[PDB]
């Protein structure tokens, strides 16, 4: 006579209790503008990110992209209030903790300066979640004066227990 | 009355249902040749990587290694059709999604050029899995002309929900 709460479910067809399949992997996409924020510079770039829900971890998969110039430090804001694919709600991206940072990852970049591409690395950390706005801080890295940045693919994940 | 599907199991000895212990940690090793692929250069090096299955994540643990020279970009192909330790099947390494990249990590290297070791980094992403061959793309990084690469230890993981 007991019931089962997600991710536990009762397969009435076979009278079997199991862990839900979507708990292991739930894919999606967010289409929108990635907001870069710095007191002296701010811009918006049209991006499409792949999302993966694996256990209580949400994975953000940034594809390769070319963006405007950035400061030696900066903030990345992804507004999940809109742009999520079908089946996803804005709440499904809320982290399960307020610890800062939740996770840090490194991104490979190329700074373009007067016709030369300079290899550098850029650190990214999950820092804040405010009302559907995810704030990914860019602490720093090797830097040089540049005109635009070429971003290699990179992924970052943080704990999320919403659904 | 109902039965339980993995990782849920019924301990008949104590009449208790629990999560399988191996679900939390399942270790193993893959022994074989690591294949580097680039149109102008390709080689094979004998390597042994440690594998551990934690929840729906498969972790690859690369030990320190010394390899031949590499291009500024490249792909690493690990053929899991053979070489896995006892208890592991080739299917146990298949990712749970096709998103590219599944995850990216950085590897520390030293490039050898005429007797000088130059510290550099390599971005690595899990990109493709085809009939047991795992494709780890090396998007780029700091580079210099070199004769051989010394690779620091590094780990990379991607979601896998197979058995």
């Amino acid at each position: 006579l007991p019931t089962y709460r997600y991710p536990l479910e009762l397969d009435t067809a076979n009278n079997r209790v199991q862990v839900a399949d979507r708990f292991g992997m739930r894919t999606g996409t967010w289409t929108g503008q990635l907001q870069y924020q710095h007191p002296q510079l701010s811009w918006r770039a049209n991006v499409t990110l792949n999302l993966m829900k694996v256990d209580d971890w949400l994975v953000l998969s940034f594809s390769q992209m070319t963006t405007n110039s950035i400061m030696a430090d900066g903030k990345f804001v992804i507004n999940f209030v809109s742009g999520l694919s079908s089946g996803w709600q804005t709440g499904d991206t809320e982290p399960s903790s307020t610890i800062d940072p939740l996770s840090t990852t490194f991104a490979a970049v190329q700074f373009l300066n007067n016709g030369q591409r300079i290899d550098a690395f850029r650190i990214m950390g999950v820092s804040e979640w405010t009302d559907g706005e995810l704030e990914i801080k860019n602490y720093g890295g090797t830097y040089t004066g540049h005109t635009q940045v070429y971003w290699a693919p990179w992924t970052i994940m943080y704990p999320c227990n919403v659904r | 009355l109902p039965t339980y599907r993995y990782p849920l199991e019924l301990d008949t000895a104590n009449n208790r249902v629990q999560v399988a212990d191996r679900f939390g940690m399942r270790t193993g090793t893959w022994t074989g040749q690591l294949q580097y692929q680039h149109p102008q250069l390709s080689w094979r090096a004998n390597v042994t990587l440690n594998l551990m299955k934690v929840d729906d994540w498969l972790v690859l643990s690369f030990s320190q290694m010394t390899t031949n020279s590499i291009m500024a970009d490249g792909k690493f192909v690990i053929n899991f059709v053979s070489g896995l330790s006892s208890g592991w099947q080739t299917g146990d390494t298949e990712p749970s999604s096709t998103i590219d990249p599944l995850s990216t990590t950085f590897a520390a290297v030293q490039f050898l050029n005429n007797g000088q070791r130059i510290d550099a980094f390599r971005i690595m992403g899990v990109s493709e899995w085809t009939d047991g061959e795992l494709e780890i793309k090396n998007y780029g990084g700091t580079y210099t002309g070199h004769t051989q690469v010394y690779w620091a230890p590094w780990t990379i993981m991607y979601p896998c929900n197979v058995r």
Partner: antibody, heavy 120, light 112 residues
Framework: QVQLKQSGPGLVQPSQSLSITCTVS????????IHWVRQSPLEWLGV???????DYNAAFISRLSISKDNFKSQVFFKMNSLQSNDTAIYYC?????????????????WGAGTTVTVSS | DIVLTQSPASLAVSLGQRATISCRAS??????????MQWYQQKPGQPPKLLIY???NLESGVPVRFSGSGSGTDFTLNIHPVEEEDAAIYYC?????????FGAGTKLELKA
């Protein structure tokens, strides 16, 4: 069809403005850089990078100006001062903007060119 | 700046006989083991079509016969199978410096 066409006056008077407009149909200009070359009896003049940044030839600065519109998928070239020497077929060339080390100063696809003859 | 000079100005070769075009650069276009040069086939009345990117790499849709090899200071391309299609003029271009300069054109004439 991934093809790009540019429109502009064929003949320009001396000391007139030679302006050609390049239109892209297959690729989003936000991902590609559009270059400009002139073939006289091939010279690289300028490039507009994705994101609006422009770099011109050192010896041609202040006589050529390049702008682009991404929402309209157009690249605009305007030259202010003309001489007898600057008579050539002008072409707009394309390069993809990727993080890969492809040695980026190259041209993947070439538009038809506009024939420029300097005569009053 | 960075000047390139091709050799020769006119090349008279028969089909299936390799004609080698040498492009020599004022400064070494190769850096850190990579060579930043490009070769083009400009047909009469048509814009140039890229043949080789970087060093010895064939662009998509380019015949396998076209091949070039060379180091930073000077680059040469040799093409042993020469069919009727490839009768156009060839230019060499360098991608290292901020202003890329096309090399002097080389004219290939198929003999009949």
């Amino acid at each position: 069809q991934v093809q790009l066409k540019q429109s502009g006056p064929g003949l320009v008077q001396p000391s007139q403005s030679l302006s050609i407009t390049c239109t892209v149909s297959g690729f989003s200009l936000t991902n590609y850089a559009i270059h400009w070359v002139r073939q006289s009896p091939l010279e690289w003049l300028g490039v507009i990078w994705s994101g609006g940044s422009t770099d011109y030839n050192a010896a041609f600065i202040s006589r050529l100006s390049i702008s682009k519109d991404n929402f309209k998928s157009q690249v605009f070239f305007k030259m202010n001062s003309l001489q007898s020497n600057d008579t050539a077929i002008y072409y707009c060339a394309r390069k993809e903007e990727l993080y890969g080390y492809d040695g980026y100063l190259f041209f993947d696809v070439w538009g038809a060119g506009t024939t420029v003859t300097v005569s009053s | 700046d960075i000047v390139l000079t091709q050799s020769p100005a006119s090349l008279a070769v028969s089909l299936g006989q390799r004609a080698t075009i040498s492009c020599r650069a004022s400064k070494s276009v190769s850096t850190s083991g990579y060579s930043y040069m490009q070769w083009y086939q400009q047909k009469p009345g048509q814009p140039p079509k890229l043949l080789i990117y970087l060093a010895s790499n064939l662009e998509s849709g380019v015949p396998v016969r076209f091949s070039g090899s060379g180091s930073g200071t000077d680059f040469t391309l040799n093409i042993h199978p020469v069919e009727e299609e490839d009768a156009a003029i060839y230019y060499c271009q360098h991608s290292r410096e901020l202003p890329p300069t096309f090399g002097a054109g080389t004219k290939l004439e198929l003999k009949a």
